[PDB]
Amino acid sequence: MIGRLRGIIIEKQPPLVLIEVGGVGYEVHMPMTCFYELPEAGQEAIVFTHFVVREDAQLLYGFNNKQERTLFKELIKTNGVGPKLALAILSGMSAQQFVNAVEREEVGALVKLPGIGKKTAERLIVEMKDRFKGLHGDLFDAEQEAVAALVALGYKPQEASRMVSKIARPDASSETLIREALRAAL
Amino acid sequence: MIGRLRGIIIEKQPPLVLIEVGGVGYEVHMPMTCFYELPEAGQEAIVFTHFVVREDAQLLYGFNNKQERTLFKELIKTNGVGPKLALAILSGMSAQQFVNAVEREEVGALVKLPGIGKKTAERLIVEMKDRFKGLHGDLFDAEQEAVAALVALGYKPQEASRMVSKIARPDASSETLIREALRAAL
Amino acid sequence: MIGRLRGIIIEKQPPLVLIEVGGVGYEVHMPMTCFYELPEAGQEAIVFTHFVVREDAQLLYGFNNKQERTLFKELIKTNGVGPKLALAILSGMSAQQFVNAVEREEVGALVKLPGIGKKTAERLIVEMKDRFKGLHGDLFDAEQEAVAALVALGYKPQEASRMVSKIARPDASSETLIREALRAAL
Amino acid sequence: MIGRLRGIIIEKQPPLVLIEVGGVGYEVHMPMTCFYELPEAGQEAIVFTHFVVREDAQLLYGFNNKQERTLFKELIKTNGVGPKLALAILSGMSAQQFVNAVEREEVGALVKLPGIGKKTAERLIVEMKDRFKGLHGDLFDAEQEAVAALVALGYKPQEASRMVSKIARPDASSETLIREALRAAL
């Protein structure tokens, strides 16, 4: 449920940051390429977070923008790749370099990074390439926002794209598109 | 344990809202019909929430008033219907339209919505109609507040209504009714 | 981990209170006898809490003082008695009345309350009477504080009382007693 | 995820402290040797914490500095030793005394403390002595910070020390060391 923290950077111990919100000091685990961009200790930072809930522990993974978080969330969906590994992948290379290596199927650039291997590198590339097709954008709009909303409700991507086509009126909010699209389907 | 959030709306990405409380950014999942009523980003919002705790994740579902939340809480009690489905039901129609479709047994209005079907639509109507009888009101008072309190303590609805009858004195707080009713039963 | 809430009472719906701390609205479940003593909506309240963590849900039980909470914590240790039942026991009678009924073995006063029975009433009395012997006090001091600390560390009650006797110097902090007692045992 | 609390000390009940952050009262369990150093009730305290998450409960263990917390975290990794026992070990002796007793293999100093025994005392000493070798320091630097970061990413300690040697340039940030070391390995 915790999507964003805004507070004072108390300490940096890569890959860990300690952000103070109120008087609560959150431990945020961040990939090294996001780590370089952090403000200075004593200054306010805004980090986008991904809460991983376990039975044994509760952890916050933090990123500087939503595109990096989505990438990380996409990455941990593939069997064999978890938060620590995803943290290492985005430490060894930026999000843009990772997407570029996925698109050009560079399965030699990723094999060096610890904990994955050769077959999982290959499976990661195949799988991520497939996931990027339907993924957001600007690294990988009202009408697109509206399809996403509909997919979130339970419609299948293609059928949601169908619904947001019939009433798709350029220069119109994503919400009215969702309202209009849902109205003419029930 | 989290029943209400009051903070600044940071971002809207239907059905998700990001509300900032202190410097903590909560991700709230809201049905589309509540979503339309939200203030503008940068303005304060008050949302009634339902915390769902899992072993893998922790989520907040948010509504603009308590009646919608109760409806949602009632809805997720029926096997086959979970938070995502309940979110879709209250996206496709308002709470009032849903109660009206339940009372008039319109099992054609709900069949269109994704993820449920025909038999579950039918079971939903039967089950919700039965639950509404004893449900709060104004969509579906000191004396009624007092019966509820007693049901919460473990008394059965009918016996709790019995207790709040013998001493039921119009123009008197629900608490004194609970105090008086509990006193003359022990 | 949440032991106390101090905030604004937003709504009362016995046995539920909604306390706002920051802009976070906590749902606190309180026994009716504590409920009567709450300030008025819009005014600040201080409630002592007991966090019950489950896999399905996370709940706060609240009391006006530490003695009531201890009683509640003691109560839920007995098989057959859980938070809802303990909530009902402290709703039907005050903490003082409950301790008095336990000491005088009144197993007719408790049998009326819903959800327990006759054998569990009897077992509750036997068990609570045994637990009160070693329990805190004022309803059921530096030297006593110090024994408690030592019991918490893992010493057995009798041996901890032994340790805080040899160096027990009236008119001296519980901490120095713990320091002195631990020093002369290792 | 909670690494630090900064708030007002409300009550002390060794080994428990109640720290108020906002209007939220956190129960922090602290070893007695850290307990002696706490400010006075009504004054601000800064405690370093270790959140233990269970299915039944959620607890905060607190320390005055990071070295004590690391020790505690190291301690609870050994089978037979849990938070309560670790709390007792750091109550009976300071962190420095404990490290000294580990280095000099004093397995008579620890045998007195309740809940452990003789074989676990012996195993604790062997195991802690082995863990201290690679452990931080000042009780047990940019280049060392950088190796730690790399170990956290998944590299093995020796190979991470190899990487931070080839480009190890005295008088240079730990982050650039991590950036430079990661660059010349992929």
UniProtKB/Swiss-Prot annotation, chains A, B, C, D:
Q: Which cofactor does it need?
A: Mg(2+)
What is known to happen upon mutating residue 56 to N?
A: Reduced binding of HJ DNA, binds dsDNA, increases HJ resolution with RuvAB
Q: Which GO terms describe its cellular component?
A: cytoplasm; Holliday junction helicase complex; Holliday junction resolvase complex
Task: Give the residue ranges for region: Domain III.
Answer: 141-186
Q: Where is this region: Domain I?
A: 1-64
One example of a Gene Ontology biological process annotation: SOS response
- Binding sites annotated in the UniProt record for DNA: 78-85, 114-117, 119-120, 123
Residue segments, region Domain II? 65-140
Q: Does the keyword Nuclease apply?
A: no
Q: What does the UniProt induction comment state?
A: Part of the ruvA-ruvB operon. Expression of the ruv region is induced by damage to DNA and is regulated by LexA as part of the SOS response. RuvA and RuvB are also involved in mutagenesis induced by UV and X irradiation and by some chemicals. Induced by hydroxyurea.
Q: Determine if DNA damage is one of this entry's keywords.
A: yes
Please provide the record's keywords in A-Z order: Cytoplasm, DNA damage, DNA recombination, DNA repair, DNA-binding, SOS response
Give the knockout phenotype.
Answer: Sensitive to radiation, filamentous growth after transient inhibition of DNA synthesis, little effect on conjugal recombination in wild-type strains. Increased sensitivity to mitomycin and UV light. Suppresses lethality in recB-recC and dnaB temperature-sensitive mutants.
Task: Give the Gene Ontology MF terms in alphabetical order.
Answer: ATP binding; four-way junction DNA binding; four-way junction helicase activity; identical protein binding
Q: Which InterPro entries match?
A: DNA_helicase_Holl-junc_RuvA_I (IPR013849), Hlx-hairpin-Hlx_DNA-bd_motif (IPR003583), NA-bd_OB-fold (IPR012340), RuvA (IPR000085), RuvA_2-like (IPR010994), RuvA_C (IPR011114), RuvA_C_sf (IPR036267)
Describe what happens upon changing residue 36 to A.
Partially complements deletion, tetramerizes, binds RuvB, branch migration by RuvA-RuvB is normal
Annotated region described as N-terminal proteolytic domain, tetramerizes and binds DNA, does not bind RuvB, given as residue ranges: 1-140
Q: Where is this motif: Acidic pin?
A: 55-56
Q: How is the cofactor bound?
A: Branch migration by the RuvA-RuvB complex requires Mg(2+).
As for subcellular location, the record says: Cytoplasm
Task: Return any one Pfam family short name.
Answer: RuvA_C
Q: How does it assemble?
A: Homotetramer. Forms a stable RuvA-RuvB-Holliday junction (HJ) complex in the presence of non-hydrolyzable (d)NTPs; in the presence of hydrolyzable (d)NTPs branch migration occurs. In electron microscopic images the complex is formed by 2 oppositely facing RuvB hexamers sandwiching possibly 2 RuvA tetramers at cruciform DNA structures. In E.coli X-ray structures only 1 RuvA tetramer binds to HJ (complex I); however in M.leprae and T.thermophilus, 2 RuvA tetramers bind the HJ (complex II).
- What family, per the record? Belongs to the RuvA family.
Function of this protein? Answer: The RuvA-RuvB-RuvC complex processes Holliday junction (HJ) DNA during genetic recombination and DNA repair. The RuvA-RuvB complex plays an important role in the rescue of blocked DNA replication forks via replication fork reversal (RFR); RFR and homologous recombination required for UV light survival can be separated. The RuvA-RuvB complex promotes Holliday junction (HJ) branch migration. RuvA binds to HJ cruciform DNA, conferring on it an open structure. In the presence of RuvB, ATP and Mg(2+) the junction is dissociated; hydrolyzable (d)NTPs can replace ATP but other analogs cannot. An in vitro resolvase system that forms and processes HJ has been reconstituted with DNA substrates, RuvA, RuvB and RuvC. RuvA-RuvB increases the rate of strand exchange (branch migration), dissociates the RecA filament and allows RuvC to cleave in both orientations at the cruciform junction. HJ-RuvA-RuvB-RuvC complexes resolve Holliday junctions and also undergo branch migration, providing evidence for a coupled branch migration/HJ resolution reaction.
The record's comment about this protein's domains reads: Has three domains with a flexible linker between the domains II and III, and assumes an 'L' shape. Domain III has weak interactions with the adjacent subunit. In complex with Holliday junction (HJ) DNA, an approximately square planar DNA molecule is bound to the tetramer's concave face, with the DNA accessible to solution on one side. Domain III moves 4-5 Angstroms toward the protein-DNA interface upon DNA binding. The isolated N-terminus (domains I and II) forms tetramers and binds HJ DNA but does not bind RuvB.
Q: What is this protein called?
A: Holliday junction branch migration complex subunit RuvA
Q: Which organism is it from?
A: Escherichia coli (strain K12)
Q: What is the lineage of its organism?
A: Bacteria, Pseudomonadati, Pseudomonadota, Gammaproteobacteria, Enterobacterales
